Ligand binder design. Sequence first.
Ligand SMILES: [Ca+2]
Ligand SMILES: [Ca+2]
Ligand SMILES: [Ca+2]
Length: 441
Amino acid sequence: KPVFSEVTVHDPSIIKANGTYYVFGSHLASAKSTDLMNWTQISSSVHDGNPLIPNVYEELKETFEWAESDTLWAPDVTQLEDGKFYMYYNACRGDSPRSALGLAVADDIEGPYKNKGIFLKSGMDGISNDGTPYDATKHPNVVDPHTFFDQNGKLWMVYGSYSGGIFILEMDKKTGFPLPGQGYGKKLIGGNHSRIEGAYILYHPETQYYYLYMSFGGLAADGGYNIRVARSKNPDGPYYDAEGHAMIDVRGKEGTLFDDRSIEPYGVKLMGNFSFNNKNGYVSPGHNSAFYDEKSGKSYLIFHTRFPGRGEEHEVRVHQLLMNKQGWPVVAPHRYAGEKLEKVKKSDVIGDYELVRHGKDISADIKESKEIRLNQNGKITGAVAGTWKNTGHNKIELKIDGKTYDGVFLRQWDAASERKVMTFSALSREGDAVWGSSLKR
Ligand SMILES: [Ca+2]
Ligand SMILES: [Ca+2]
Ligand SMILES: [Ca+2]
């Protein structure tokens, strides 16, 4: 029987070193595991003695002073070619995009990290890093970085939260700082205080797309946080959703703040708030990272989540990512327990399921699963009427609610009944996800 050990790390950013997985999150929090199931908490908050930066208030004083905050927001740690660990740290006042983004470097992944300096600021009253006066409708909040190598070995950093949008900068592979002359870099999506943050870019060698993951909505339990994805053949875009909408054009209306209605039609929404059979479930799952394992070919979505009825409590969750026939990733409905893709036959997948329809909205509503049956005759009955078929090794196609969904079947552990179940997870061109988890073991 699978065993989990939980940790609390907001906005987890995954990195593997020395055969061990680490997550680095906000508030200088971190955790590690060798199996992605049993995590050990390393650090939890910004304070004297935090092992990652034990003198943090002195070490990063310029950042705390600029941001007028006593904590840190969502970092990234990335190993560069010198073998050292580069932490892109940031702080934000919280009520406005008054933020600083800097670089610290460690010899060892668990610290200590040493400050190399601030290299981006937002929320100044005056000249911004692009030379024009700072304007949060068009300039980023300098937080939430992800620094990554593309398949050509070029180093990039994508970043941003709300404010002027999500931007990407080309980075110096030797110093870890941005190449000169870029200002805030190139916009990928957003503007006008859109609720979009937590960018993360992952390349998949089979489809040869870069996937731009991002979180729409608000992180709190009333915020409707949801992970969405878009893709491009290039690390720096242009990024498109499954309807071919250009992410660069997605933003709230001029003169508005947090215009969710304008942005929610866009992107492929992978997961919102849900509860299978009203047992446990997730609320505002989001701010993800993602990992592709070259050895196994498996991919993983790593994120934090809140929970129905548990207020603002959050923990790290890991779900396997599968790849549908169209080259869009689908999230396995249950957390990772060591399971792998297998050949399924018709008798394996026929039967009753709990169905979650995540939809395409930004919504704080917790969506309850409803019962359907995948009948032997290829029809879906119960909560919805439709059709389905299994193709290839383990692909599913469903037709429901006027749409066609392409996805993948996967046997998983259900941690609410302590039993193995059959699942499917699929996506429509329209960008909404459906999950099924079988009533049968
Ligand atoms: Ca992040
Ligand atoms: Ca039920
Ligand atoms: Ca549409």
